[PDB]
Structure of Beta-2-microglobulin segment LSFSKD:
Amino acid sequence: LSFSKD
Amino acid sequence: LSFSKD
Amino acid sequence: LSFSKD
Amino acid sequence: LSFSKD
Amino acid sequence: LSFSKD
Amino acid sequence: LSFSKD
Amino acid sequence: LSFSKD
Amino acid sequence: LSFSKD
């Protein structure tokens, strides 16, 4: 489970 | 911003 | 379990 | 800012 | 800006 | 796990 | 700016 | 585990 936002 | 769970 | 924000 | 748990 | 995970 | 920035 | 984890 | 900065 993973989430990323730049 | 980054999140992880194994 | 991990979280990072720069 | 960074957080980890094993 | 916000993030949450339960 | 909760994060906030104004 | 805030972070919490229980 | 809690963190805050104004």
About this structure: Chains H and F do not touch (no CB pair under 8 Å). The longest strand of chain H covers residues 2-4.
